[PDB]
Design a protein around this ligand. Sequence first.
Ligand code: 9RY
Ligand code: CA
Ligand code: CL
Lengths: 247, 57
Amino acid sequence: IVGGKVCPKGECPWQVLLLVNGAQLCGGTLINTIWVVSAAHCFDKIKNWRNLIAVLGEHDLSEHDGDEQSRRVAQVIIPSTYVPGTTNHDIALLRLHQPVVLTDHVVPLCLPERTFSERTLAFVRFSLVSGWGQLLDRGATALELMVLNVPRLMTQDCLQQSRNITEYMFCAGYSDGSKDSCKGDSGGPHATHYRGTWYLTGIVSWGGCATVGHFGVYTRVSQYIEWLQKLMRSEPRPGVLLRAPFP
Amino acid sequence: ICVNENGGCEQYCSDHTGTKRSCRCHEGYSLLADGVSCTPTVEYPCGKIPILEKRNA
Ligand SMILES: O=C(NCc1cccc(-n2ncc(-c3cc4cncnc4[nH]3)c2O)c1)Nc1ccccc1
Ligand SMILES: [Ca+2]
Ligand SMILES: [Cl-]
């Protein structure tokens, strides 16, 4: 995250850190005690699917304060329509091996109904994006969880104000190169407040980082609600990686 | 109704045949008698920040 601030400890309680062999991989969003939403591309290169760890209640990477909860990732589900190394359909649903325990520091973000998300949330101007990504283009990653308020653009307006956005994406942020999500933030939440509650509307994808004339691109979660809901009702299958038909 | 002002619903909104509308709430919430408002039914409902909710309790 570029041009943000530290998310005060516990104020981003749905934020997930994904690790592979103890190394920072990506962000994620907790939506239930056993389900995490991330970005498909995070998994393009995974060798040993068995070494994937999700951490909840994380804040400062430099210290252990005991609010952290680590779980193995039992399943990574990606839409059939996703092509590795690309941007469209950049979403993943992760099943934890064991539920996390809800605490003051570990809370799911609400996965909204599609209709609600489309008719209402999509019109909330500002939303929050977070992660432990790069603080600057070509810079070091953050040790403390960072958060950034970004405004959403209608795709028409995005294209106009820009100096390949599909229906499965949306634009948010700033074109002045001051404020953006960045490498290391992928899979993280774009969270939207409505009438006292926060909802998942976006997933940090990829592309650049605080590139002048450009906007951040986010996976449009509303397109995937039904897909996610169906999967969450399904029994686990052997083998970590699962490609599931979309729609 | 639902497409406008969220049908007055705090959360989810369903249209019905007629000048009918039903509001709903996410799991971990219940709908109040006003037919629009949602109140938590659990300690840690989704999309609420405990340290902030407590800071306001
Ligand atoms: O290599 C892979 N996937 C691995 C893999 C894992 C985890 C992170 C990343 N990864 N690399 C760059 C960024 C990234 C830039 C960026 C800018 N602004 C916001 N967010 C961002 N994120 C990123 O998230 C890649 N795929 C593949 C397949 C085929 C060809 C080429 C690449
Ligand atoms: Ca820590
Ligand atoms: Cl496997």
